[PDB]
Amino acid sequence: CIVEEVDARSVYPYDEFVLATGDFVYMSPFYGYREGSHTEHTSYAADR
Amino acid sequence: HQLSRADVTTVSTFIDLNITMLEDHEFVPLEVYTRHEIKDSGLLDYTE
Predict the structure, then answer these.
(1) B45 contacts chain A (CB < 8 A)
(2) CB contact under 8 A, B44 and A22
(3) Do B44 and A18 touch (CB under 8 A)?
(4) Cα angle vertex B9, ends B3, B11, to 5°?
(5) What gap in Å lies between CA A3 and CA A41, rounded to an integer?
(6) How far apart are CA B28 and CA B32, in angstroms?
(7) Chain A neighbours among B 25-44 (CB < 8 Å)?
(8) Rounded distance, CA A14 to CA A40, Å?
(9) CB atoms within 10 A of CB A24
């Protein structure tokens, strides 16, 4: 089991971001449930 | 009586010409984006 604090970077329009490992995350950094953040981009199922 | 030249009204035959020197000016270095900024604009740095 490995836990790593990493820097994450996102470019406009901020529909995805990358980690220091080079792994992409195909979700907006600003995705959420409040203030209309549920309209932000996600490429993953809701259970993820 | 006796007078000084300051006691006599003075009119001028001279035509005025007021030439002033162009002043020194300093040009500071100025860049819109530093090369560090240009390097950092990439999302993923392969070397890092």
Answers:
(1) no
(2) yes
(3) yes
(4) 135
(5) 26
(6) 13
(7) 43-44
(8) 9
(9) 13
